[PDB]
Design a protein around this ligand. Sequence first.
Ligand SMILES: O=C(c1ccc(Br)s1)[C@H]1CNC[C@@H]1c1ccc2c(=O)[nH]cnc2c1
Ligand SMILES: [Br-]
Lengths: 338, 20
Amino acid sequence: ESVKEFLAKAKEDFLKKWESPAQNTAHLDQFERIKTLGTGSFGRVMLVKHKETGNHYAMKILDKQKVVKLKQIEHTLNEKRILQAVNFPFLVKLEFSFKDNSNLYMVMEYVPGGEMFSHLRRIGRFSEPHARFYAAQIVLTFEYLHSLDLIYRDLKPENLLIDQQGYIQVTDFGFAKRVKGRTWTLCGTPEYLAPEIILSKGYNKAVDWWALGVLIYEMAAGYPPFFADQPIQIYEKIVSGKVRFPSHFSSDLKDLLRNLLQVDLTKRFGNLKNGVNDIKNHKWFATTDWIAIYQRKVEAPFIPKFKGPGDTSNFDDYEEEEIRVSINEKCGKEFSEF
Amino acid sequence: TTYADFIASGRTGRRNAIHD
Ligand SMILES: O=C(c1ccc(Br)s1)[C@H]1CNC[C@@H]1c1ccc2c(=O)[nH]cnc2c1
Ligand SMILES: [Br-]
């Protein structure tokens, strides 16, 4: 009942911003560009410092012409409209957004701990208590997002940041979409795609719960449940209905994952009459205090190392590229509402 | 081992999204 009350208020706040999005709330020249933190098909994220406050941020720079060539116009509009409207302890905040002749800009909170991806690959795998701590945060984040009729659609260690307190911050809302009922877009990352996506079946929020199963598996195993050298081989494994677990996986863990990695939607945890509660109440989560997690009162598995503000040693190095702004406006109409 | 197979695979680096 307290959960319903909280979510009801959360939706009221979200819908106000959803219907009236913030737009043009800063300018490129207000930020000092320092270093690239990550890259994508049509842009990059750079560590920046806001000159008037001295605050550090992570600024995503999207080349409008590249967005259009990859047919991601509506997805980029989705991303910005959603991210400026949401608010949850484990979601990165969009602080400013604006555009110029050449690029779109999304100025987000900088999360100095780096990607879960980097730590997971380096350490090999997380213990189950460690993986559970992260997993719980995704569970609550998805409960929140789904209550707003949003689907996230790109869960993976590369899209999860670790903050200074050791907590998760979900970023990368590029495929996030607000949809009541059913949607069809083939998108995501091969290892994490639900069978209904690759089979072009038409799908809903249940694909996020499948992806959570993939994520928990990979965190606790050190490798995903479905992997191969070519995506087609990955897809063949995903739809096959077969999954094998490391012998070190607990029996509770295996039970949870068999229910999350359920090819049959009518049997998938997160998608039954009991909704997210079949997950929250699963044996594997019996020690999880969902409220303490939300309030950030639980001791994290580890805190990332930090050496003063603006330090980036928790991020890989990327090739840098000067930002150029054309003297002509590119793709004005397509991105008008940004 | 499954772990050794993973580490020798071409997909232990960052994975690109697909679409379209
Ligand atoms: O560089 C990134 C890109 C995504 C799309 C394009 Br174009 S480039 C993301 C990818 N996965 C994490 C990466 C990233 C890195 C740092 C931050 C940060 O500190 N705050 C908020 N979001 C971040 C996202
Ligand atoms: Br991108």
